[PDB]
Design a protein around this nucleic acid. Sequence first.
RNA 1: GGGGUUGAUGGGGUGGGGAUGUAAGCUCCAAGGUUGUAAGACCGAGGAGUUUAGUCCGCCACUCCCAAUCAGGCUCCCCC
RNA 2: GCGUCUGAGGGGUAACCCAGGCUAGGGAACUCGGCAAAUUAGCCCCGUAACUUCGGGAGAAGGGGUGCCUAUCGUGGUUUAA
RNA 3: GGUGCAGAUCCCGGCGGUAGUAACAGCGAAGGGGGGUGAGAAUCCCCCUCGCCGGAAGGGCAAGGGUUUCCCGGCAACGUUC
RNA 4: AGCAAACUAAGUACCGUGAGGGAAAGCUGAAAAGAACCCCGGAAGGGGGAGUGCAAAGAGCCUGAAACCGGGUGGUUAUAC
Lengths: 54, 75, 80, 96, 339
Amino acid sequence: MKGTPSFGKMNKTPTHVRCRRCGRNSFNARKGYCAACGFGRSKKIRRYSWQNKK
Amino acid sequence: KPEKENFEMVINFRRVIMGRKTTRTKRAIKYVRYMVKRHFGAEKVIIDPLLAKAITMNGRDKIVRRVRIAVKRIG
Amino acid sequence: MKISNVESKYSMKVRGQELLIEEARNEKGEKIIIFQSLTSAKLLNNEEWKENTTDAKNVEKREDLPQDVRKITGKILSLI
Amino acid sequence: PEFQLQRRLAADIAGVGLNNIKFNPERLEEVEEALTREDIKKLIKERAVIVNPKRGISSGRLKERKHKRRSKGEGRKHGSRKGKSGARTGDKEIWI
Amino acid sequence: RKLSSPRRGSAGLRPRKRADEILPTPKNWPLVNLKEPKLLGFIGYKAGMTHVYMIDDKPTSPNYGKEVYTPVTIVESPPILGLALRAYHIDSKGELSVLVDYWANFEEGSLKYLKRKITSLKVDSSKMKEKLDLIQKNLNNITYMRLLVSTQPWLVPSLGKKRPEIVEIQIGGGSIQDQLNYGLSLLGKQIPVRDVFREGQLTDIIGVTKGKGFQGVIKRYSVVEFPRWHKHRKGSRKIGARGPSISTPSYVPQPGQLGFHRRTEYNKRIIKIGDNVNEINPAGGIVNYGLVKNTYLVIEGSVLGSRKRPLFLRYPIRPSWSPESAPKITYVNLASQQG
RNA sequence: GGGGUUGAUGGGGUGGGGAUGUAAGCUCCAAGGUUGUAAGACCGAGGAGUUUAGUCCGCCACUCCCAAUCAGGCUCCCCC
RNA sequence: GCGUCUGAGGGGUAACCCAGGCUAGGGAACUCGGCAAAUUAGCCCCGUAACUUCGGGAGAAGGGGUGCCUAUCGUGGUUUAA
RNA sequence: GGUGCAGAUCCCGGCGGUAGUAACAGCGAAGGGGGGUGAGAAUCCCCCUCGCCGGAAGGGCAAGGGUUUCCCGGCAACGUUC
RNA sequence: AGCAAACUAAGUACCGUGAGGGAAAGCUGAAAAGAACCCCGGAAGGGGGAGUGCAAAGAGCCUGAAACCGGGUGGUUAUAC
């Protein structure tokens, strides 16, 4: 069932672990990629121009 | 001055029975305290542990029809 | 009725617990057996009471008790 | 007045259930002063801490009922059998 | 589609409230009925019930002159005590107020049982001499004469009470002057039941019925319980709708008090008046009442009230027939009522 | 709605009237079996006797044996 | 191991509700509808129809037996064991 | 000139009425007597007894949690009541 | 209000698996002189009597409105909007 019984299976190992470069818990473990700074396939810091309103 | 008697009497659990079943034991113990205070002027009553088990060795909702007690009603 | 005289008093130990058995007679002259297992207790205000066991007769053998007492104690002794 | 430490230490020294450990009501001031596992071992010896043994089910009724079942056939008959014939004696074991 | 079914209960009995006294008095009394001065009622206590075997009296009955089985109620009736004499007149405003009361207990009839209900007259206030000449002065414009009587419960041990009940009973007979003379002879005396009734007569019973407390609508009005699924389905012991409108949503059934109502019965016949209680007491006593030891009435049928209920017995106000004496009784059930 | 010692209001004791169905213990018998030279004694579902028994009674009667004691609050003394 | 699926006490215990037991005579007359409830029920022996893709149907349907006590018999296992 | 509020199922803050009311029952457990500590015990501690689980309410260890573990001292808040 | 952020730690706490989202909260007095001591209370910047200060809305501290609640003053109330 969509709600309370299925949230019980959210106690395994997480999808995201700590990242050495940025110190945020955004390193996607299964893909070898930080979803916050790009560490893993970007040498440059992950940055986009939509990342704040103008 | 109330007499420091060694009376002994019979307690009838007529009215404790025909009440609520699952409190018959709890009410029987409180009925002995009331009767000793009524017939002896006691302000504090102590029940011997042997007497409490004789009223209900049957559990919680099964008790005896009557019991005979002896009161050493000291000062 | 009111108890007039106590004939015999005993003291027996059951599974590490202490018993007092008294033989008495009422005004009518009927024999009653009184079972007590309590030696000390509080009072109303405010001190300690202790039963006197000097007159008690210690019991070690099971047929040391009278036949009348021995044939009645069986039911009570289970619920000790 | 809490001394669950003494009850816990005594139950594994004695190797019994924690509900098999009873104190002596007349010597509780002495149990209350025990802090170490050496203190508790001495109290068990001095009978300040009682260790109850484990019980068992009496076998008097079972031995008499089994003897009658064996020699007179009582209780073995077809008003007492709930299971199937092959679950009481397998047919392959009969042939073997 | 809107079949026909009669309404549940009577619309003339509302409110179904608790009776405000345990011994009611009739509001209306039977006419003179062409007699000579006598009282038109008596007071009794309901004891129990049994059954007798009588030979039928009703000349029109299908069982005439045959032994038939009838239930009966036992009513214990010691003598009553005559207390005072009361005169009514049409006063100014044209009402039926009371003219005066003439009490007489001092000459003989010094009772303290009577003080358990009324802290009655002191010796200082025994000026009843001029209450009597007021009745004689205002004769010829007096309409009704009534006698205050008192029950004597202390003569009934099974009825564990000593304070009495006070009611007033009407006199019907000859002239007003003739009735005043009769009422002065009963004053302070003891009135047996045989001075009022006789065997074979009809009576009317007034009393309070057995109480039953707060009750539902299936016992109070005998409404129909919801059938099948609804026996399983959200509550069945209730009525569906409580009216259509905002018209003071009306007189539909509601739960509330059942029993302990003042009611009245008609045409209850007296079969026997006895003094020998050994002929009426069953083995082991009447269950939950006791033993009869006074004069008793045997009344065929049922009577409202519980055991030890005070009942007012009145002359029949719409009698069905006029019986004669002797409904002969051949058997009385004296067996035990337990088991 | 009653009683409250100037008392039978509830309990106890003793009788009455009831419900089940004839208690435990003891004596005799029991299909057979274990012994014992025999006599005898030992086990045994159950049957009979003691025994309309024993247990129980939110019914009735008699009997002051026990308890209705102690304590608190409110309101009045008008007319004369 | 627990009385911590962590609030209790009083009540001749009102109506009513949620779960449960029993009902005389009748037996689906209830209702959209036998819904719900009731009936039957384990094991051994006997016995078992139409139909059928020949395997099934089939635990068809139906009938009889069963406790306790006192003794026995047969078959088999195991023990250095035809 | 960021200039006047009763309304925008207006935004934010404080406070009523319902009301000392519902709920603290339902998922198959239960307490009683005696004693102690303490300013204060239905609820904490000791002894006796009674009840419940007993293919789980007992035993052993994962992922996850992250000090919850052990000793001493507390009770303003915290624990469905204390 | 002014930047989301005038303050015991603002992109801080906290919410989301994640990209991301995102608060609240200023003020004793000139000077702590921050209430010694005594009675009550288990304790409590708790009560009472004191004392400090120009002044105690004295630690929940500038001023201290209304809603709301409690006590009192003045009118009035169980035959009627």
